[PDB]
Amino acid sequence: MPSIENFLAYDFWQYDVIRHLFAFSTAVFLAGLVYFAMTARTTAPNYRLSANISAVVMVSAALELGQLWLLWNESFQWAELQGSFVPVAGERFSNGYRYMNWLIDVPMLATQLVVVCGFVGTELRNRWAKLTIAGVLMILTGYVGQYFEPAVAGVPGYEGAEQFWIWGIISTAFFVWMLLILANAVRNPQGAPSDEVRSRLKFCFWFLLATWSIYPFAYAMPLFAPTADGVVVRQVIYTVADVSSKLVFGVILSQVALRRSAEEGFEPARVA
Ligand SMILES: CCCCCCCCCCCCCCCCCCCC
């Protein structure tokens, strides 16, 4: 179904800002690829998977925001007499498109935290399995919910506003399940981590919780019946969430993985 973005006209500034958010984000994630490539070589073999997962998330995210950039350009047309970008008939832009690549991002971001906690073999795979089940169900139920956001925003001729709350609350339950799995992981790190590593692992959990929590906030923006300006704010919120949850989290986690590597006597990690 059409997202709230589809029912508004945008002045040049509003349209161009949002276009730049998508382009800039794509470029930043691609650049992140270089950092994770370099950091992988200095990480111990037992923690290198985390850096590799960050690379997978950067490519997933680049394609996410790349697609939003293309859909944004294709879904609106300059109307010279109005001096505004107006929605094209038969072309629907939706943030809902981002949900598909979340199927990669969410389980992977969760799993890489578990990897740096130092879980291996069956214990790692059990947690990956549970995080993938919870994560996929969170995203699918969320997707059903956001399908009805036009009705929530009071866009005339749209119904099913209750679906937004039903499936939103269901999705939130799956989110909490994921957070409880991860809380358990960071509370019970494997090996003999320093007090510094234990504290930094908990930091990583709470940073994931904080940045992930922005996504339900962006989900809820239709409640505020936004104008074009509110849509700009919503896409800024998503950009902060995307860059913080994927790249900044990735960098912070990579530094904990390097510390664990150094503590365990991996020389290239000590040198770095
Ligand atoms: C110290 C190691 C040497 C430096 C490595 C840095 C090289 C860059 C990272 C490698 C990634 C290149 C793979 C290209 C695929 C990108 C996908 C494009 C999506 C649109």
Numbering used by the authors: 1 to 272
Passage from the reporting paper:
We thoroughly characterize a member of this subgroup, namely the protein ErNaR from Erythrobacter sp. HL-111 and show that the additional glutamic acid results in almost complete loss of pH sensitivity for sodium-pumping activity, which is in contrast to previously studied NaRs. X-ray crystallography and single particle cryo-electron microscopy reveal that the additional glutamic acid residue mediates the connection between the other two Schiff base counterions and strongly interacts with the aspartic acid of the characteristic NDQ motif.
E64, a unique characteristic residue of ErNaR and Subgroup 2 of NDQ rhodopsins, is pointed towards the RSB and interacts directly with D105 (D116 in KR2). In this case, only a minor spectral red-shift of ErNaR upon pH decrease might be connected to the charge redistribution with the counterion complex including the D105-E64 pair reflected in different lengths of proposed LBHB at pH 4.6 and 8.8 (2.1 and 2.2 Å, respectively). In contrast to KR2, ErNaR adapts the N-out conformation in the pH range of 4.3-8.8 in both monomeric and pentameric forms.
